[PDB]
Design a binder for this molecule. Sequence first.
Ligand SMILES: Nc1ncnc2c1ncn2[C@@H]1O[C@H](COP(=O)(O)OP(=O)(O)O)[C@@H](O)[C@H]1O
Ligand SMILES: Nc1ncnc2c1ncn2[C@@H]1O[C@H](COP(=O)(O)OP(=O)(O)O)[C@@H](O)[C@H]1O
Ligand SMILES: Nc1ncnc2c1ncn2[C@@H]1O[C@H](COP(=O)(O)OP(=O)(O)O)[C@@H](O)[C@H]1O
Ligand SMILES: Nc1ncnc2c1ncn2[C@@H]1O[C@H](COP(=O)(O)O)[C@@H](O)[C@H]1O
Ligand SMILES: Nc1ncnc2c1ncn2[C@@H]1O[C@H](COP(=O)(O)O)[C@@H](O)[C@H]1O
Length: 278
Amino acid sequence: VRVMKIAQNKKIVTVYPTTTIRKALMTMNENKYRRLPVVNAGNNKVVGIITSMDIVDFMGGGSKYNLIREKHERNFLAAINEPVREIMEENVITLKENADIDEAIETFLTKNVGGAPIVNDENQLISLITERDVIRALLDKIDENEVIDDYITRDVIVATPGERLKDVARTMVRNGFRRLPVVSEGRLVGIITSTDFIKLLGSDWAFNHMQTGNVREITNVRMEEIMKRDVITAKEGDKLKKIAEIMVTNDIGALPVVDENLRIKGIITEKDVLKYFA
Ligand SMILES: Nc1ncnc2c1ncn2[C@@H]1O[C@H](COP(=O)(O)OP(=O)(O)O)[C@@H](O)[C@H]1O
Ligand SMILES: Nc1ncnc2c1ncn2[C@@H]1O[C@H](COP(=O)(O)OP(=O)(O)O)[C@@H](O)[C@H]1O
Ligand SMILES: Nc1ncnc2c1ncn2[C@@H]1O[C@H](COP(=O)(O)OP(=O)(O)O)[C@@H](O)[C@H]1O
Ligand SMILES: Nc1ncnc2c1ncn2[C@@H]1O[C@H](COP(=O)(O)O)[C@@H](O)[C@H]1O
Ligand SMILES: Nc1ncnc2c1ncn2[C@@H]1O[C@H](COP(=O)(O)O)[C@@H](O)[C@H]1O
């Protein structure tokens, strides 16, 4: 069952190694695509990939932050004029154009990636497949009585309403999690994702600070200011197919699992759903 058969027939939105970080961000925010292959202009060969998590790293979450703090002496606006090649991931995990669905699933499940460029024998970009694409294709094949319980991640990494963005960013990047439930006194009170951090950057409130920057008030912002308070949740006993359908029809990748009292029992994501087909 060739992945190309599911592969989104659209044109893949890409950037080049010399595209600035700023332009890559605009590309992300505009096209709503939070995963961008980096290709030569060129021969269309995949030479890198950049996602919102790399941007969260750059902003403070990880080692890429030292482009701002050291080279550009804390100037975020200057730093974003650097070519995306400075912060992209190289050594991309890709699939061959003759790869089947089984391979894609094993790749997603064992290599901690949610999306992979599909390339030909010259490493030229052909398409791209993500976990959502696969779940969407296989949704009707999930038994309707199957429950979510065995698929839930029980030990949840979490943010709080009072945490500063700079510290939540660390939590996201160190743990490799795009989405953190926000918890206060054991109760779910919101959700925050790497996407929220990009959206903050493209705000009026943000560009205002950057000019007088003082870029620092961006990363000092607390979760309560920017989190989504009303969260789509799952609960023990829910059908896997219902949950999978909610994700795929809403472009959401993660639901916090809660009590009727909103205590957190776990989290379930698209990768977990795909463990049904492992
Ligand atoms: N760069 C891109 N160009 C075109 N389509 C994309 C691109 N990135 C993701 N998609 C598609 O848009 C949807 C969003 O991807 P998921 O949300 O699946 O990946 P991501 O969180 O990295 O953006 C997916 O269904 C995927 O098929
Ligand atoms: N196909 C891939 N090959 C190599 N690295 C990738 C790939 N996809 C994403 N990444 C990297 O994994 C890190 C986490 O990204 P996200 O958190 O955006 O990835 P994912 O949604 O696939 O779990 C980022 O540094 C990103 O560049
Ligand atoms: N915040 C979290 N705390 C603990 N585990 C998580 C968290 N987010 C995701 N996971 C788990 O890690 C594995 C891979 O998660 P993934 O699909 O990359 O999540 P995300 O979309 O947040 O990056 C899954 O088993 C998922 O349940
Ligand atoms: N892409 C990068 N990611 C993280 N840190 C960087 C990056 N580029 C430069 N730096 C750091 O910023 C400073 C600039 O050094 P240099 O670019 O060699 O003049 C050094 O402290 C580097 O460690
Ligand atoms: N389970 C959820 N319930 C409500 N909003 C969510 C949920 N998951 C993600 N979001 C929001 O959806 C938007 C895109 O998130 P993302 O899953 O990172 O692409 C962000 O503003 C998230 O805060």
